[PDB]
Write a protein that binds this ligand. Structure first.
Ligand SMILES: *C(=O)c1ccc(-c2ccc(C(=O)OCC)cn2)nc1
Ligand SMILES: *NNC(=O)c1ccc(-c2ccc(C(N)=O)cn2)nc1
Ligand SMILES: Cc1ccccc1C
Ligand SMILES: Cc1ccccc1C
Ligand SMILES: Cc1ccccc1C
Length: 9
């Protein structure tokens, strides 16, 4: 989940 967001950065 975290990674899924973090791709933004
Ligand atoms: C949510 O973004 C997210 C993405 C990916 C993962 C995740 C957890 C574990 C692995 C892995 O290779 O584990 C080896 C034991 C890969 N990806 N978690 C949460
Ligand atoms: N928000 N994330 C990024 O902008 C980002 C782009 C690319 C990478 C990355 C990581 C690792 C490799 C590699 N060949 O191991 C390439 N690009 N991380 C973050
Ligand atoms: C489990 C989950 C839920 C919502 C967004 C992304 C991810 C990986
Ligand atoms: C696991 C990780 C760590 C730092 C930035 C992005 C991601 C996907
Ligand atoms: C395949 C994938 C998707 C989103 C963030 C990181 C990675 C390794």
């Amino acid at each position: 989940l975290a990674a899924a967001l973090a791709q933004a950065l």
